[PDB]
Write a protein that binds this ligand. Sequence first.
Ligand SMILES: Cc1cn([C@H]2C[C@H](O)[C@@H](COP(=O)(O)O)O2)c(=O)[nH]c1=O
Ligand SMILES: [Mg+2]
Ligand SMILES: [Mg+2]
Length: 172
Amino acid sequence: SKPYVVIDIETDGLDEKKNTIIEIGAVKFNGQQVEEFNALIKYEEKLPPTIFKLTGISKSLLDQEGRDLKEVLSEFLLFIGDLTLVGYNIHFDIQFINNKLNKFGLPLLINKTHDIMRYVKDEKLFLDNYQLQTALKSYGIEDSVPHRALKDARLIYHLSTKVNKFLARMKE
Ligand SMILES: Cc1cn([C@H]2C[C@H](O)[C@@H](COP(=O)(O)O)O2)c(=O)[nH]c1=O
Ligand SMILES: [Mg+2]
Ligand SMILES: [Mg+2]
């Protein structure tokens, strides 16, 4: 019943400093209903075709639909406000987002956070592994993970509504 925002990003690599954000997505429960945020990011580098393999995102898509990262980050800060942020291995997203906020002279995140993966690890002890895809199956969600920011955030949000220990902490 408390508001929260599930966040997810896609990147061109794993290094918060040297790699960059190519898509941001978020699903906000504002206390009454759901709202959504999503932007692809303009990109001037060489996207490792392994990124194309994983996400389906190409240079052509970023050129055609991408938006300036600083502008998008400013809008993202307005969308989340000071609400609790939720994710799946959320430190990955926070490390990238804070690195780029700092780079552009924007405020950094000070939001409280909850990580659905932590709750899954404690509830589903016998999972083969703890990739998001594996966790979803364990809770009766058979969707394939597309590795697109808003689509993944929707799946994480759906998962959040099925993890009782998380819901108990967010109640009231
Ligand atoms: C799964 C995976 C992700 N990544 C990067 C690119 C993805 O956009 C970003 C976040 O992953 P994700 O699709 O699960 O949300 O991390 C890699 O560089 N190699 C990988 O094997
Ligand atoms: Mg992710
Ligand atoms: Mg993703």
